[PDB]
Design a binder for this molecule. Structure first.
Ligand SMILES: CCC1=C(C)/C(=C/C2=NC(=C\c3[nH]c(/C=C4\NC(=O)[C@H](C)[C@H]4CC)c(C)c3CCC(=O)O)/C(CCC(=O)O)=C2C)NC1=O
Ligand SMILES: CCC1=C(C)/C(=C/C2=NC(=C\c3[nH]c(/C=C4\NC(=O)[C@H](C)[C@H]4CC)c(C)c3CCC(=O)O)/C(CCC(=O)O)=C2C)NC1=O
Ligand SMILES: CCC1=C(C)/C(=C/C2=NC(=C\c3[nH]c(/C=C4\NC(=O)[C@H](C)[C@H]4CC)c(C)c3CCC(=O)O)/C(CCC(=O)O)=C2C)NC1=O
Ligand SMILES: CCC1=C(C)/C(=C/C2=NC(=C\c3[nH]c(/C=C4\NC(=O)[C@H](C)[C@H]4CC)c(C)c3CCC(=O)O)/C(CCC(=O)O)=C2C)NC1=O
Ligand SMILES: CCC1=C(C)/C(=C/C2=NC(=C\c3[nH]c(/C=C4\NC(=O)[C@H](C)[C@H]4CC)c(C)c3CCC(=O)O)/C(CCC(=O)O)=C2C)NC1=O
Ligand SMILES: CCC1=C(C)/C(=C/C2=NC(=C\c3[nH]c(/C=C4\NC(=O)[C@H](C)[C@H]4CC)c(C)c3CCC(=O)O)/C(CCC(=O)O)=C2C)NC1=O
Ligand SMILES: CCC1=C(C)/C(=C/C2=NC(=C\c3[nH]c(/C=C4\NC(=O)[C@H](C)[C@H]4CC)c(C)c3CCC(=O)O)/C(CCC(=O)O)=C2C)NC1=O
Ligand SMILES: CCC1=C(C)/C(=C/C2=NC(=C\c3[nH]c(/C=C4\NC(=O)[C@H](C)[C@H]4CC)c(C)c3CCC(=O)O)/C(CCC(=O)O)=C2C)NC1=O
Ligand SMILES: CCC1=C(C)/C(=C/C2=NC(=C\c3[nH]c(/C=C4\NC(=O)[C@H](C)[C@H]4CC)c(C)c3CCC(=O)O)/C(CCC(=O)O)=C2C)NC1=O
Ligand SMILES: CCC1=C(C)/C(=C/C2=NC(=C\c3[nH]c(/C=C4\NC(=O)[C@H](C)[C@H]4CC)c(C)c3CCC(=O)O)/C(CCC(=O)O)=C2C)NC1=O
Ligand SMILES: CCC1=C(C)/C(=C/C2=NC(=C\c3[nH]c(/C=C4\NC(=O)[C@H](C)[C@H]4CC)c(C)c3CCC(=O)O)/C(CCC(=O)O)=C2C)NC1=O
Ligand SMILES: CCC1=C(C)/C(=C/C2=NC(=C\c3[nH]c(/C=C4\NC(=O)[C@H](C)[C@H]4CC)c(C)c3CCC(=O)O)/C(CCC(=O)O)=C2C)NC1=O
Lengths: 185, 162, 172, 172, 162, 162, 172, 162, 172
């Protein structure tokens, strides 16, 4: 309805260029493009589960049997698998229901897109995307951004772009912030 | 939580639209069934004390080894018997909560979530809970459509344990 | 995001005690008053666009500073945004009405709303005036009883006014 | 992503001095006593599940509030999370032991863990006591003198205890 | 760094698994090879002054235009000779650091990363350093598998430069 | 699978690099350990039948109820006894496979993957196999580092089931 | 990102008044001297590689601690990064020069760069000195009256210097 | 905003390259065509009041049926007449900015963006302004290149509204 | 992927019989000559760059059509791509040599490579010739009898040739 209100980007490791060979802190790249055997496909599926949902919350009920079968028969790209995790009801209960739009922009960007918010203005900038278009459409555009297509092509599991001397997003961001802890004792 | 009302609301929120007549029809059906649902919940909770103890004895009879051979996973000690009472009480309380909520939401959030993960770590055989829930499904003391609702939730738990 | 049934169940789960007889009768009362709730949401949703538009027409004239050059509602784009946000608040309030609690209003909205506008540079006081004008519009349209079997739905009107007030106080 | 070797090499690179004879003989000692280290880590990883499970039973017996209804280790989902956190701490400590350096432990696990626990409300003090229980259990099982070629490795056991203590203090 | 121990740790960390016997066997292999690796490192470091000067002269002899052609990217001036000696010394020093670390970690972090950018901006043709490393590879003064290890790291640097 | 050889190769493949000395040293350690690993595998397979039978009797002694309680999940029937022997034989065969492979690869690809689903659906209590593998760990009849390796893989299976 | 013309139209839109004669003649003066602006940016960008390389040699000559082992741009990796950041600042200031306003420079280059360098350990003061070195280089190369139709362009060079100065002040 | 200069800058920034001669040629073209556009802007600002008055009467005559119906979205009342004058002035005020910016940037930033939702909610028919601006389009008093460039922007806006 | 050990284990698991004594003896023979495999891989990988460069110069001298204008290996961009793919094939072959099995080579490099070149329009026959040039160069460098402990490594050299041949036959 509205061209998303422009945000001012801040300097970040992901934005910067660097001529580095992979370190031991390299995020590790789970690519289904090679069409590896089923056993390695299990690792790739697990990494996507580990990214969209946190390692903490990926239990049996969280596991979608259909998704497990999806990424096994060289089906919809790993990107679409990520989107399926994102729009699944368990994700909406675990993340969307427990945070406000402004925090949701940050969480989804850190996990799905894999880069931190450029600034508070960007958190505001995409909050309306969540509101007007709907959360499903917000994650749709989040993984359909030109940035995403360059970052992880199609068959590459999302990873933190470059946490060079930086805390990993999973270990700095909880499932929900203390603001919702008002509903807890 | 997976409550009928909230499920309709979330479905409308996905499409960013005011609540359409489809969702309103769904919640109307929930309200129409709520009379039988709440009466069933009352019946189960006011008979809860007998039910919990009966289920404990039922599992003790079906699996005598769970009462005799030593181990923390078993109720060989009075402390273990207390643990057994506590957990079967959890299941009964969750079923009443699901009955009043009108959906599987409560038991999915407070019980079924990660149930498999922990029942293997603490070595609590799911079959024990299966038999206990079967006893509760046989002695619930409900009748008619109230009974069908309660038994549906009980069997949801049974299938989840398996 | 909870509903009435889920709210009482959540408190009961925190306590760890089977639903008390008192809670049962409370929820029975909630079911007794279900039809009126459904009627109200149906009526408000059928006229939603007209409600918000009519209130907006008056709002911009009664607060001219916003539409004068240099004000926050000036330019076509920001005017579009103000209309959009008015409709957003109306939508989440309708959600709340059907739910029976203000949980949804405070969870995915109204959690830091004031801070967002304050950083954007929008005057929060003017937003509060807009929310209150919307509140009057909504209470009026729901409380114009005709075409249906009458009842004392004043309770529904009061709780709707409470939702709108909660939003207005949260943004200012 | 450092170990003992990388730590000393990084100091030497910061100074810009060719590796001194003293540094060479200081790391040859580490390699000569490496088989003991490997045995210790093998023993702790072989009993990981039992260690965490027994420690968890003890924690819930000493602090029943966690497993009572309304406590943070209730609803069987949070119980799974608690067990997972305990084993995560053990896992990062095991990494630290095999490396011989605390770099990995401070780079991934202990880099601000306090903030996450503080925000969620998970009691950090209880986590600390749980880590200490795991510490005594693991050190005892690894130092069990029967079943292995005998030797004197109290220093390595003290280092293992130091890693556990570092985590327990940093999170609490 | 990419040290073998830490590389195994990171490999296990990505999957969230405790270090099984695979990682332990890898580290055991590192410790078994450490005897030869330390021998080679001591040999290179104790003779680290004759070889650096010899390599400087070797490059001057293979490429006589590098010390007479006018400019700033040459060793004609004494300051240029100092910088040239420092560069060949950096390569040798990094090789010894990699020998002690057991892995190519130090080389990658301090040398190989961004090598092309610097060699292109300051007009330092890789061939010069290639010849210097060949001289060091021929006069290192080692025997057996220790010599193999020295001639492996130096050749890695050679094949990384070019 | 997660065989040491393949693990190093994959680590170099994701980083688009030729196999450097780090990976070569790792696989060298694997080959040094392979002599003892092959010895251990030979030992286990030569007395496989005795181990299988003894483990079967061990679980029958630890769990008397599995030999009488009626139902398909129990081995009260001779057919069930045959199935129990077949399963513990599978576990032993995979232990020998892991010994030869020098890693947990075979175990993960043929046993651990989805182990929970099967042991829950057919109501096969994990404790049964836990006790069986404990017996195997006690009667393996190995000595030295070979015993260490076999014990480690058996315990990996035990902790995976737990 | 607002260039000169966009800046004046945006200010005029905020005031709500047709473009005033004074602003008209200001932008007309900019256009009359437009060829000079284009030639300046063409000279700076056509010698970009040499500019950065010469400035780098000067920086390492004046501050040898940088290229000394265990310094701040030592190792090929950090050396490449320092060269990269010098070139990046040059690129965004050339953008700013062509635009005629500093909006791009402060929005996409200097928007939090100071915090980045505070965390990294890179000296902000030294990078400011480097920016000044590039300022002198770019001003000298553009002020080569040999090879171009002559005229008085020092006035236009003063704002190029101003943009370099703005970056140098913003980076520390 | 979408200024030719700004668009070239953005195209170069997304590639990360210094300004090539292509972009410099484009900006040169902008400067070369900025003589006529600035003349046109000067002309239209100096006679702005008279032309807005004429356009206001033009729309009053073309739509007297809106000029007589009483309401908030009409100019029948004197307050509405004042509102109509200010909005006609707004369109002229934006067109001058468009002329100076040499692009459609101002059009999209101060209008066009969300024109549909505004013309749906307030239901202020764009045809009103369209007729007024066609009066302006003939009576602007420009000639030659100034006239044709201004006409291009005006008709872009007209066809964008529909 | 399956290495040699994994291949024998996988076949034995498919049939469902404990590994027989014959298989054990075979694997013992493999480990007895493992040092030779490691040495060969080390020697080939340390000369990768020279191998690919010499083979490339020879290929373009023998088939000038590739470097003629309008040919496939032209325009200096496709030349870079050609060298990159030649070294890619060499890299996956080295992986295969270290593994002792062709599974990795057949699962990543030559897997569906014929189709790739056929669509791109490159002559697959020429690719095969290039792989053969690399084969002779690499086998000569790896079988160089001067520099190391003498012995007969001919079996392993034939295996290396077999891998190169497999790639050459799968691309053309
Ligand atoms: C649209 C929903 C859907 C269906 C129906 C489906 C079928 C399906 N079953 C599969 C696997 C399989 N299916 C079987 C099935 C059987 N083996 C037997 O002995 C039985 C007779 C039979 C069970 C009744 C087996 C053994 C595999 C594993 C094959 C493999 O990956 O190696 C696979 C291969 C990849 C995977 O495991 O996901 C697919 C695609 N996949 C889907 O996404
Ligand atoms: C509200 C959701 C919820 C559930 C379901 C829950 C279950 C639960 N049951 C447990 C244990 C247990 N549960 C039992 C129960 C039984 N003993 C028997 O003989 C019977 C067969 C059976 C009753 C039917 C026993 C004995 C333990 C202790 C296990 C041990 O110490 O090893 C434990 C481990 C901690 C403990 O020992 O209490 C949990 C977390 N906790 C929860 O927060
Ligand atoms: C979670 C629910 C939710 C809310 C509340 C929300 C509000 C919201 N409104 C915004 C903009 C805006 N909001 C308004 C609203 C107003 N303009 C006025 O004149 C009045 C004072 C006021 C109405 C009474 C305006 C004008 C803008 C645009 C600001 C600008 O671009 O300068 C922005 C800025 C970022 C953007 O445009 O995307 C947000 C986040 N978005 C949401 O998803
Ligand atoms: C700078 C760019 C810009 C534009 C274009 C713009 C348009 C614009 N026109 C408006 C209203 C209006 N427009 C008219 C116009 C007319 N009535 C008639 O009978 C005529 C046929 C017609 C003149 C052609 C009237 C009467 C209103 C007031 C309606 C109201 O407040 O409800 C409003 C509502 C608030 C207000 O009154 O200002 C906006 C925002 N706003 C902007 O910031
Ligand atoms: C698909 C969603 C849905 C709607 C819209 C719905 C409406 C609905 N409203 C009803 C009645 C009614 N509605 C009211 C409500 C009101 N009393 C007042 O003073 C207010 C003006 C108004 C509140 C807005 C009353 C008093 C009745 C009749 C008695 C009753 O049913 O409780 C009835 C019962 C008799 C009838 O059909 O009229 C229905 C079915 N039911 C639905 O399932
Ligand atoms: C790899 C490093 C790492 C750490 C350390 C970590 C901690 C961590 N633990 C969490 C949850 C949790 N952690 C606990 C832990 C405990 N409950 C208790 O009663 C005990 C005192 C304690 C165990 C000893 C619980 C119960 C939750 C779930 C909280 C909830 O969802 O309500 C969460 C919430 C987000 C999520 O579930 O993913 C994080 C981030 N996460 C990480 O990625
Ligand atoms: C795959 C990695 C790996 C393992 C698992 C391994 C085991 C291993 N441990 C050994 C010795 C040993 N292990 C210990 C360890 C201990 N002393 C104590 O008092 C404690 C209870 C325990 C430490 C916690 C000692 C003292 C020796 C003999 C000396 C030595 O070589 O370290 C030895 C040599 C002598 C022998 O055959 O027993 C081997 C081969 N070697 C390896 O390369
Ligand atoms: C440890 C990682 C590391 C490396 C490798 C490194 C190399 C390096 N060598 C340099 C210069 C240089 N290196 C040489 C070296 C040579 N002159 C000759 O005649 C020979 C052929 C050759 C020696 C074999 C010269 C002449 C320069 C100066 C280039 C110039 O200023 O033009 C420079 C430019 C900055 C210097 O003083 O300002 C760098 C960065 N720096 C590093 O931090
Ligand atoms: C190769 C890897 C592999 C494993 C591990 C495996 C397990 C496995 N065990 C099974 C059954 C079984 N497993 C047992 C085993 C036992 N009964 C007892 O009393 C003991 C306590 C215990 C032995 C320690 C029994 C009796 C069945 C048949 C159960 C049934 O049909 O209900 C079945 C069902 C099919 C069948 O009846 O054979 C599977 C799939 N299958 C596999 O392919
Ligand atoms: C587009 C605007 C922009 C800028 C400017 C920027 C800066 C920037 N420079 C970086 C690297 C770096 N920057 C420097 C900087 C310097 N060291 C020195 O001695 C000098 C004084 C100085 C050169 C002027 C160094 C040494 C690194 C490497 C860090 C490392 O590898 O550890 C990094 C780290 C992450 C990465 O490399 O991706 C950032 C974010 N990022 C941006 O997006
Ligand atoms: C493709 C983009 C583009 C460029 C690069 C460009 C440059 C440019 N500079 C010019 C002249 C000129 N350039 C200068 C510039 C200078 N005076 C000095 O003292 C300094 C040494 C130097 C500043 C760089 C002067 C004074 C003139 C003559 C007057 C003028 O036209 O600006 C002219 C007109 C005469 C000619 O063709 O040379 C052009 C076209 N025009 C363009 O459209
Ligand atoms: C980092 C991993 C690693 C490597 C690389 C390594 C090399 C290595 N190769 C060796 C032997 C050897 N190397 C060869 C090699 C050859 N003979 C030929 O005629 C060919 C030209 C060539 C093979 C293509 C032979 C025949 C032996 C002796 C027997 C053997 O051990 O394989 C030896 C033992 C004798 C000695 O040199 O002291 C070592 C240590 N050891 C290691 O742990």
């Amino acid at each position: 309805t509205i061209p998303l209100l422009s945000y001012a980007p801040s300097s970040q490791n992901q934005r910067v260029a660097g001529y580095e060979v992979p370190n031991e802190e390299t995020p590790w790249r789970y690519s289904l493009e090679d069409a590896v055997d089923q056993s390695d496909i299990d690792e790739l599926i697990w990494a996507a589960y580990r990214q969209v949902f946190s390692e903490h919350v990926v239990l049996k009920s969280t596991r979608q049997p259909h998704l497990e079968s999806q990424l096994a028969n060289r089906a919809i790209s790993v990107r679409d698998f990520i989107r399926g995790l994102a729009k699944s009801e368990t994700f909406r209960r675990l993340v969307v229901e427990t945070n406000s739009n402004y925090r949701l922009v940050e969480i989804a960007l850190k996990r799905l897109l894999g880069r931190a918010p450029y600034n508070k203005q960007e958190e505001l900038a995409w909050s309306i995307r969540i509101a007007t278009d709907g959360w499903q459409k917000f994650v749709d555009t989040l993984v359909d951004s030109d940035e995403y297509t360059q970052n992880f092509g199609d068959n590459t599991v999302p990873y933190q772009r470059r946490r060079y001397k930086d805390r990993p997003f999973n270990l700095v961001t909880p499932r929900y912030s203390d603001y919702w802890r008002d509903k807890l004792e | 939580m997976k409550t009928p009302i909230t499920e309709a609301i979330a479905a409308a929120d996905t499409q960013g639209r005011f609540l359409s007549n489809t969702e309103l029809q769904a919640v109307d059906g929930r309200f129409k069934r709520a009379v039988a649902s709440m009466e069933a919940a009352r019946a189960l909770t006011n008979n809860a004390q007998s039910l919990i103890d009966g289920a404990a004895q039922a599992v003790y009879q079906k699996f005598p080894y769970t009462t005799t051979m030593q181990g923390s996973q078993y109720a060989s000690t009075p402390e273990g018997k207390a643990k057994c009472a506590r957990d079967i009480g959890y299941y009964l309380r969750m079923v009443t909560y699901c009955l009043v909520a009108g959906g599987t939401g409560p038991m999915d959030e407070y019980l079924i979530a990660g149930l498999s993960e922990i029942n293997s770590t603490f070595d609590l055989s799911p079959s024990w809970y299966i038999e206990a829930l079967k006893y509760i499904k046989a002695n619930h003391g409900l009748t008619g459509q109230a009974a069908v609702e309660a038994n549906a939730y009980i069997d949801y738990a049974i299938n989840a344990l398996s | 995001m909870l509903d009435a049934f889920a709210k009482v169940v959540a408190q009961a789960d925190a306590r760890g005690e089977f639903l008390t007889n008192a809670q049962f009768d409370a929820l029975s009362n909630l079911v007794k008053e279900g039809n009126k709730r459904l009627d109200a949401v149906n009526r408000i949703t059928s006229n939603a666009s007209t409600i918000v538009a009519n209130a907006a027409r008056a709002l911009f004239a009664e607060q001219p500073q916003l539409i004068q050059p240099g004000g926050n509602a000036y330019t076509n784009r920001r005017m579009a945004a103000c209309l959009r946000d008015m409709e957003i608040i109306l939508r989440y309030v309708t959600y709340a009405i059907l739910a029976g609690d203000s949980s949804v209003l405070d969870d995915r909205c109204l959690n830091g709303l004031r801070e967002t506008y304050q950083a954007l540079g929008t005057p929060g006081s003017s937003v509060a005036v807009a929310i209150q004008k919307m509140k009057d519009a909504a209470i009026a349209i729901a409380n114009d009883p005709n075409g249906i079997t009458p009842g004392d739905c004043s309770a529904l009107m009061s709780e709707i006014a409470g939702y709108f007030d909660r939003a207005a106080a949260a943004v200012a």
